[PDB]
Amino acid sequence: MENFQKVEKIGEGTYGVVYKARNKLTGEVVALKKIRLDTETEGVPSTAIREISLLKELNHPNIVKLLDVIHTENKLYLVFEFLHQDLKKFMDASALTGIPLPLIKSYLFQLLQGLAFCHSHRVLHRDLKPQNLLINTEGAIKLADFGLARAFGVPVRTYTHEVVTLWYRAPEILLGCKYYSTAVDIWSLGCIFAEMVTRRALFPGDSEIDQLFRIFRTLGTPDEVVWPGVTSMPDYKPSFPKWARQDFSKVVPPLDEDGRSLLSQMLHYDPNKRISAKAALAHPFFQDVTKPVPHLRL
Amino acid sequence: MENFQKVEKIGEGTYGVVYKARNKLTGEVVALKKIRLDTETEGVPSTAIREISLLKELNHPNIVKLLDVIHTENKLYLVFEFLHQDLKKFMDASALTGIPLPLIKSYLFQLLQGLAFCHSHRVLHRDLKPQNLLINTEGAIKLADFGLARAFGVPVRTYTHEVVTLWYRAPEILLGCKYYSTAVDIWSLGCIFAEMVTRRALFPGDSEIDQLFRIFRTLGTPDEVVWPGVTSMPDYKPSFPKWARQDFSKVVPPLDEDGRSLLSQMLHYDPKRISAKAALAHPFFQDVTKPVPHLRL
Amino acid sequence: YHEDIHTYLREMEVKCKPKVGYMKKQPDITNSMRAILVDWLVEVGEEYKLQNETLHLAVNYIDRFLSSMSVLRGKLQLVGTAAMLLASKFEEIYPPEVAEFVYITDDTYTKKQVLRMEHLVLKVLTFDLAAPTVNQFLTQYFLHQQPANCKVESLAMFLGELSLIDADPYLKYLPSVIAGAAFHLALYTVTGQSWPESLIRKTGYTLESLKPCLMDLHQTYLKAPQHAQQSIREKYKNSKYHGVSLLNPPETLNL
Amino acid sequence: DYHEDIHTYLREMEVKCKPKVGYMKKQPDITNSMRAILVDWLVEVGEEYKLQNETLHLAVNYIDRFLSSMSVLRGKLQLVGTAAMLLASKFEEIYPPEVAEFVYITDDTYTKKQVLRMEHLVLKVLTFDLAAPTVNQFLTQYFLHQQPANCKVESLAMFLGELSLIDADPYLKYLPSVIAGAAFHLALYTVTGQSWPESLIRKTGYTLESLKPCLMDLHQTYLKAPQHAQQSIREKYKNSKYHGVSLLNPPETLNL
Ligand SMILES: CN1CCN(c2cccc3nc(-c4n[nH]c5cc(-c6ccc(N)cc6)ccc45)[nH]c23)CC1
Ligand SMILES: CN1CCN(c2cccc3nc(-c4n[nH]c5cc(-c6ccc(N)cc6)ccc45)[nH]c23)CC1
């Protein structure tokens, strides 16, 4: 840790802080995630263990690179490539006239390439939200925060705690499915996609039931025809009101015919039929994809 | 270094000390070579650089294993497998009895296997002497101290300075040759072999000229027929006395006909000197066993 | 992506290999001692209701650690404890706290020792914890059951778990191959059927290619009641595993 | 006896010491041109301090491997090279220049502490694996198959091999053994009109066919040498120690 100059604090977390730093010998600008080690009670946190072990298998231009792990006495530092801000702040900054559609298409294309790589390497992210997505001045966007990510060579058990902030959580999870699938990542990305287009969260639920019902009101209450098995799922109630699916032309006005088609496939109710990241990359929506550079307010 | 318990100092050096140590988590007994880093003046010593980089290419049962390198702030530690003593002290302990011949044969056989491996990996040891050779209770012997060792994918240039204590130094070096060859390691091993057999240094010279002359008195003063080129070598003088080669039966009395033949090929003047690999195929080793030594610990 | 994942698991299992002959190069410990350790880890898993995957990961970590580190017999259990702790953190939704792992060792080791060993194992394994296992390959194979049979799945898992106990001969087989033999042998024992054509196409393994591993596995299965280590048999006579460890093995495979 | 085993071992180790061929693309602030300037400057420093040619080759190997896994800013590229030359001198030289000398040649752009810290960093990044095979070592090995020896051929082979160090494109994608083989043939052809000998074909297993792609590039580098922006090697090899071989005119064609 001797060759690093701390530049500024750029992030606060549960197990520790993230600093912008500079390698004094090479000049490389870096993000340092500091983890304080309670050496009486816990040892190395599960989040660090998963994020280090899975991330070092994931070398891809749309996944934030782990450059080094400096593991010592009573501190663990993760050294990452430095990016310039997260998508949430960029969305907020772009409120008085949106992210241009060519940049939205670029970002979704890159995010699906990052995800496809994850999934091909049996890694579930499980926490895709705009503040875990990092952007740079040259027009790149990358997946970050793999603390909740998991290997699925064996199917990953859902919990009753902890994760995917409610707004990006998939219906199967809300309805209490036993195992995660790669469909949950695709769902979250669909919500993020819509949120870029409309400048608002697609499903800003105040609670689990409220989250579910906002989805039902926009996409329609699912039945055994649309989603074989729904009615047998743990947290499904026959009391659920039956709403009608509304036009995507009114849910996402600015999107063209192709855009609506992709989004509907990403928000398909049945996880088995929800579009894969790979299949989404082959969608005609991306046939004219470019890589614009944004104007970040740094 | 937090997982290592220092047991005792077992060795003192130029760049640092060697400790016997214990891994507190695994129980592994190790040798730790500590190198203090003067971080104003010099940085990592050339000895450590060569020793580390060459030794980690050399995994062989007759070459001491480098287990780890703990490189930090202002200290460099080399972690080695632990052996029980050096050949010099074992020789001293065996003065009133000699090392039995089967153990001598075993030790030479293993040293040649270690050396052959070094040479096949383009590494010259350059400092084979009894105190750099480590033994254990199970009857193993291994090459140690690669501080002076050198890679020779490009020929290694001779020094004015620093080298092979005088007694194990080869004639070409004494006569000022320009490049080392693998023959210099074989020469040293010949001297160590004879010393084990006779219980005395073969050529205990007080000086460079005295070292040469002791070799000449035993092996004969070399001429152009024995060693094509001798007379043109930098430190050759025509004024050198001309001694006759004496019988090996009187230089190494306890050796049989095969032992004498091997030693004479290892002490050949022209660096025609037997290779380690060729020495391993010598009929001297056609009944080699692996006896255990009486280490007086 | 289930094809992509099998393909990727096949790639990674060749890289996570420990040294097959490491125990010979190991001065103080033996296969028997390893057998005792692994059997104990099975008990710990039952005591703390840990996933089967956690057990398999922990054993993979132990073999790789012991492939490059000499350990004295009195420290072998500390390696296993740290390995099980790390495997739980990687695989469990909520792992047992460190104090729990200190207590199953009957206070033979301290909290500090266990936490220091955790650090050392992470260093030695270079944080490469997401290793492929027999368990993961079995799980992928189970999706080619026409139709599913829980008694076959349980017996396949039982046989696969038995392979963890004996370094000789199972260290010299890939998890994908052990999994293939366990699946066939369980399938053959319960339903009389053989390694299906769908899995032949998926894995590229024929029944011929599985034969060497199959003959070892069959021999382990026949001798299971006589093995000195019994925690796996005891575990698999439970209702959750349909008492499959009390099933009689086939006298012949007719290969 | 052992020069077969050593050649074999060098062939094994050169496949392992490979840097990433495309590392310069993944590098944000520095370019091939900047690398060219650095290596050319290292040639001067070697002449200034009378360092072995092997030291130069090792240093460049260390730089390419370091830059294969580390991002460096243009203002620190020279610090990497200095530390690399320092380490190569320690490995190869009988007595290397003291650290203060290496601080000297940089015109006090860097401090003693910086150079010593970069030395530690490069040792860590390379994991103390400093005994890399080089074009120099393979040339030396091939020179033993000269019937009979010719110092003009040896000097020209060494000149061409040293020119290969300057241009990452295209020479990063060839093994040292292959570049050596092409340099030997090209020098041999230029001086004596002979070709890659059958003894070396048996030893190396390389045919004149297999060397052709590298030969093609090396011949083109040789033709353009007088126009290259970097000139330190041409200057070095017009000395009498090298029989003024950098003045020998290259053939216009190779007749393959
Ligand atoms: C909520 N936001 C996030 C963005 N923050 C931020 C602001 C300004 C500049 C920033 N640079 C980063 C950053 N660069 N590289 C990173 C890698 C991880 C990482 C950490 C863990 C894993 N597993 C992977 C990548 C997290 C954050 C960063 N984050 C920045 C502001 C606060
Ligand atoms: C002068 N002697 C030497 C033997 N000393 C000694 C006595 C008793 C037990 C000893 N154990 C060692 C030892 N084990 N492993 C070693 C490795 C190196 C090493 C160091 C450097 C390299 N390059 C390779 C191996 C040096 C010494 C040792 N040396 C011992 C007593 C004093």
Domains D5-18+132-256 and D19-131 agree in fold: yes
Of A69, A120, A159, the CB nearest to C1: A120
The H or E element containing residue A48 is: helix A46-55
Query: HSE (CB half, 13 Å, CA atoms) of D175?
Result: 17
The H or E element containing residue A32 is: strand A29-36
Pair of tokens at residue C136? 């993961």
Question: Taking Cα atoms as reference points, which of A200, A279, A275, A213 lies closest to residue A240?
Answer: A213
CA distance C176 to chain B (A): 31
Q: What is the number of the ligand 1 atom nearest to the C-alpha of A83?
A: 14
Contacts of B2 in chain C (CB under 8 A): 116
A98 in a known ligand binding site: no
CA gap C26, C167 in Å, rounded: 13
Q: Do D91 and B43 touch (CB under 8 A)?
A: no
Q: Supply the residues of A annotated as catalytic.
A: 127
Residues in chain B: 297
Nearest residue of chain C to residue A37 (CA atoms): C115
| Ligand 2 mean position, distance from CA B90 (Å) | 13
Q: Give CATH for domain D19-131.
A: 1.10.472.10
Residue A49 CA: which ligand is closest?
Answer: 1
CA gap A207, C118 in Å, rounded: 39
Domain with CATH 1.10.510.10 in chain B: 85-295
> Cβ contacts of residue B184 below 8 Å, gap of 6+?
B124, B126, B164, B169, B170, B172, B173, B271
Alpha-carbon distances of B83 from B23, B30, B86, B294, D63, rounded to whole Å: 15, 8, 8, 15, 38
| Ligand 2 mean position, distance from CA B19 (Å) | 9
Contacts of D114 in chain A (CB under 8 A): 25
CA distance B130 to chain C (A): 27
CA gap D72, D61 in Å, rounded: 16
Classify B175 as helix, strand or coil: coil
Q: Do A52 and C136 touch (CB under 8 A)?
A: no
Pair of tokens at residue D130? 């400093």
CA gap B123, D91 in Å, rounded: 13
A5 in a known ligand binding site: no
Domain ranges of chain C: 4-17+131-255, 18-130
Residues of D with CB under 8 A from a CB of B: 1-2, 5-6, 9-10, 13, 52, 54, 86-87, 90-92, 94, 96, 98-99, 112-113, 116, 119-120, 123-124, 128-131, 133-134, 136-137, 140-141
The answer as to CATH 3.40.50.920 being correct for domain A85-296 is no
Say which amino acid occupies A166.
L
Classify D197 as helix, strand or coil: coil
CA gap B88, B92 in Å, rounded: 6
A144: Cβ below 6 Å to ligand 1?
Answer: yes
A132 in a known ligand binding site: yes
Q: Phi/psi zone of residue A45: left (φ > 0), alpha (ψ -120 to 50 degrees), beta? A: beta
The H or E element containing residue B38 is: none
CATH architecture type of domain C4-17+131-255: Orthogonal Bundle (1.10)
Alpha-carbon distances of C221 from C34, C208, D96, rounded to whole Å: 19, 19, 66
Specify burial of residue A224 (Cβ count, 10 A radius: 0-12, 13-18, 19+): exposed
- Do C164 and C3 contact (CB within 8 A), yes or no? no
CATH superfamily of D5-18+132-256: Cyclin-like (1.10.472.10)
Nearest residue of chain D to residue B74 (CA atoms): D120
In the β-sheet with B17-23, what is the strand arrangement from edge to edge? B4-12, B17-23, B29-36, B75-81, B66-71
Question: Taking Cα atoms as reference points, which of D27, D71, D54 lies closest to residue D131?
Answer: D54
Question: Taking Cα atoms as reference points, which of D123, D194, D130 lies closest to residue D156?
Answer: D194
Handedness of CA A78, A84, A89, A91 (dihedral sign): negative
A146: Cβ below 6 Å to ligand 1?
Answer: yes
Q: Do C117 and B28 touch (CB under 8 A)?
A: no
Q: Do A25 and D73 touch (CB under 8 A)?
A: no
Q: List residues forming the annotated binding site of B.
A: 10-18, 33, 81-83, 86, 129-132, 145
Radius of gyration of chain C (CA): 18
Q: Do A27 and D72 touch (CB under 8 A)?
A: yes
Of A2, A3, A27, the CB nearest to D73: A27
- Do A151 and C53 contact (CB within 8 A), yes or no? no
Residue A11 CA: which ligand is closest?
Answer: 1
A10: Cβ below 6 Å to ligand 1?
Answer: yes
Residues of B with CB under 8 A from a CB of C: 2-3, 24-28
Question: Taking Cα atoms as reference points, which of A236, A219, A231, A204 lies closest to residue A274?
Answer: A219
The H or E element containing residue A142 is: strand A141-143
Chains B, C in contact, 3 or more Cβ pairs below 8 Å: yes
Q: Do B25 and C75 touch (CB under 8 A)?
A: yes
Pair of tokens at residue B292? 């255990």
Orientation of helix D151-163 relative to helix D53-67, angle to 10°: 20
The H or E element containing residue B278 is: helix B276-280
> Cβ contacts of residue B150 below 8 Å, gap of 6+?
B50, B54, B123, B124, B126, B156, B180
| Ligand 1 mean position, distance from CA A44 (Å) | 21
DSSP D76: G
| Ligand 2 mean position, distance from CA B31 (Å) | 7
Residue of minimum CA distance from atom 4 in ligand 2: B86
Residue B77 CA: which ligand is closest?
Answer: 2
Question: Taking Cα atoms as reference points, which of B36, B24, B194 lies closest to residue B107?
Answer: B194
Transcribe chain C into DSSP letters: -HHHHHHHHHHHHHHSPPPTTTTTT-SS--HHHHHHHHHHHHHHHHHTT--HHHHHHHHHHHHHHHTT----TTTHHHHHHHHHHHHHHHH-SSPPPHHHHHHHTTTSS-HHHHHHHHHHHHHHHTT------HHHHHHHHHTT-SS--HHHHHHHHHHHHHTTT-HHHHTTS-HHHHHHHHHHHHHHHHHS--S-HHHHHHH---HHHHHHHHHHHHHHHHHGGG-S--HHHHHHTSGGGTTGGGSPPPS----
A142: Cβ below 6 Å to ligand 1?
Answer: no
| Ligand 1 mean position, distance from CA A31 (Å) | 7
Q: List residues forming the annotated binding site of B for Mg(2+).
A: 132, 145
Domain B1-84, CATH class in plain words: alpha beta
A127: Cβ below 6 Å to ligand 1?
Answer: no
Nearest residue of chain B to residue C72 (CA atoms): B27
Residue A145 CA: which ligand is closest?
Answer: 1
Of A2, A3, A26, the CB nearest to D73: A26
Residue of minimum CA distance from atom 1 in ligand 1: A131
CA gap C42, C62 in Å, rounded: 14
Q: What is the number of the ligand 2 atom nearest to the C-alpha of B132?
A: 3
Pair of tokens at residue B221? 């003063």
Buried (b) or exposed (e) across A12-40, using 16+ Cβ within 10 A?
eeebbebbbbbbbbbbbebbbbbbebebe
DSSP A179: B
Largest CA distance in chain B: 65
Pair of tokens at residue C82? 């740290």
Domain with CATH 3.30.200.20 in chain B: 1-84
A145: Cβ below 6 Å to ligand 1?
Answer: yes
| Annotation: CATH topology of B85-295 | Transferase(Phosphotransferase); domain 1 (1.10.510)
Q: Do B43 and D99 touch (CB under 8 A)?
A: yes
Classify B78 as helix, strand or coil: strand
| Annotation: CATH topology of C18-130 | Cyclin A; domain 1 (1.10.472)
Specify burial of residue B270 (Cβ count, 10 A radius: 0-12, 13-18, 19+): middle
Q: Do B275 and D54 touch (CB under 8 A)?
A: no
Please provide the distance, in angstroms rounded to a whole number, between the alpha carbons at the two ends of chain B.
28
Chains C, A in contact, 3 or more Cβ pairs below 8 Å: yes
- Contacting chains of A (3 CB pairs or more, <8 Å) are C, D
Distance from chain centroid for Cα D81: 14
Of B46, B121, B277, the CB nearest to D96: B46
Pair of tokens at residue B290? 């692996």
A40 in a known ligand binding site: no
